[PDB]
């Protein structure tokens, strides 16, 4: 029945909207089986593996694949509730919920749709799906597991990226205040001031040069992810089609649009140029909610093309 259409391009050139420093408000762990923990004991440190390191190692027979089951957003509102955390903004949702909104321009194909609520006490407007372990997936689950180290002072070889560790951030950007709740890979140095710019994330990818349109696509992927939980650093574990560890890069989040500029070409999405289409797009989805009850269901979906498009649930 009734649509409603937001345009990548119909946006104007605008200067790039003000986004404030991620702050943590709380954080949470959730152990290999699943028991969900209001502390950082599933918070681990990055060390530097050992170059060559073969990430086929223990694929599959000492690999517990992911749960493939999108989680519901209730468990962050519930995280907030039990430490008696008010929600006095306009988003509440899982950060790579915000990022797919953010890079829709660079990948017309992912598809994806979110269902969003706004909460009839709180009024704040809920984003959630409710729609991975090939040996690719593996490499890097595997990456991750051999970069890092548990808590051992304070407190085997098996792959189990379902054990997490996550943040949960206040962030503005423009007028849009945001709660957005991500998996954190490790830690640089001891927990402290805020902690995210001690967080580390961790990829592996094949090496390509700047030039390569779809290497400077996956940078800008990964610095929207990061900078959207303010977490400081990306290390990438480059490897081999083998599956080998080649090579590490350890970038600092904001280093990545800087490194990026020489290699830009005149029609190519930026960083500053997604930051403004997100801020049109947040205050539009905002807008439109708002025009309804709260407790009014609605999706919102992009499926290629150029825009998203926002209905609402019957
Ligand atoms: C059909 C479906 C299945 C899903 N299955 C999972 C799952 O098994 N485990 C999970 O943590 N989240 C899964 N999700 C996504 C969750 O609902 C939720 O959005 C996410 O866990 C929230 O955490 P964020 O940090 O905001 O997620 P993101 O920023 O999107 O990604 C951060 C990290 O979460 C992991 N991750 C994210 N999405 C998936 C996925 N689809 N499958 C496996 N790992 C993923 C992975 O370690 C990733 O690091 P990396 O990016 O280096 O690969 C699924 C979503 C859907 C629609």
Same mark, same amino acid.
């Given at each position: ?8 391009? &119909?946006?104007?050139? $605008?200067?790039? +909207? ?7 408000? $709380? ?22 593996? +050992? ?17 493939? !089951?999108? !989680?519901?957003?209730?468990?962050? @509102? ?29 990948? +017309? ?23 991975? =372990? ?10 991750? $597991? ?7 002072? !304070? ?33 640089? &140095?001891? @927990? ?10 961790? @990829? ?35 490897? &081999? ?23 830009? @070409?005149?029609?190519?999405?930026? +960083? ?8 049109? $797009? ?8 708002? =025009? ?19 209905? =609402?649930?019957?």
């Amino acid at each position: 029945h009734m649509l409603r259409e937001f345009s990548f391009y &119909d946006v104007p050139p $605008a200067h790039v +909207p003000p986004v404030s420093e991620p702050l943590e408000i $709380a954080c949470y762990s959730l152990s290999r089986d699943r028991e969900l923990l209001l502390d950082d004991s599933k918070l681990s440190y990055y060390y530097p593996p +050992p170059l060559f390191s073969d990430l086929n190692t223990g694929f599959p027979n000492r690999f517990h694949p992911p749960k493939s !089951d999108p !989680d519901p957003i209730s468990i962050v @509102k519930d995280v907030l509730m039990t430490k008696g955390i008010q929600m006095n903004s306009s988003f509440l949702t899982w950060r790579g919920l915000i990022t797919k909104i953010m890079c829709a321009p660079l990948d +017309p194909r992912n598809h994806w749709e979110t269902y969003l609520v706004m909460d009839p006490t709180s009024g704040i407007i809920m984003m959630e799906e409710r729609t991975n =372990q090939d040996r690719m997936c593996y490499w890097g689950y595997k990456f991750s $597991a051999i970069s890092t180290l548990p808590e051992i002072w !304070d407190a085997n070889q098996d792959v189990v990226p379902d054990e997490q560790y996550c943040s949960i951030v206040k962030i503005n950007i423009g007028k849009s205040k945001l709660i957005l709740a991500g998996q954190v890979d490790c830690i640089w &140095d001891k @927990k402290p001031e805020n902690p995210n710019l001690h967080y580390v994330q961790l @990829k592996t990818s094949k090496k390509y040069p700047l030039e390569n349109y779809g290497m400077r696509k996956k940078l800008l992927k990964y610095w929207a992810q990061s900078f959207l939980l303010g977490i400081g650093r990306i290390i990438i574990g480059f490897r &081999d089609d083998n599956g080998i560890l080649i090579e590490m890069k350890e970038l600092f989040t904001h280093q990545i649009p800087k490194m990026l500029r020489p290699y830009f @070409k005149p029609n190519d999405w930026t +960083p500053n140029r997604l930051l403004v289409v997100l801020e049109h $797009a947040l205050e539009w989805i905002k807008q439109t909610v708002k =025009q309804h009850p709260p407790s009014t269901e609605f999706t919102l979906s992009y499926t290629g093309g150029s825009k998203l498009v926002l209905r =609402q649930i019957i």
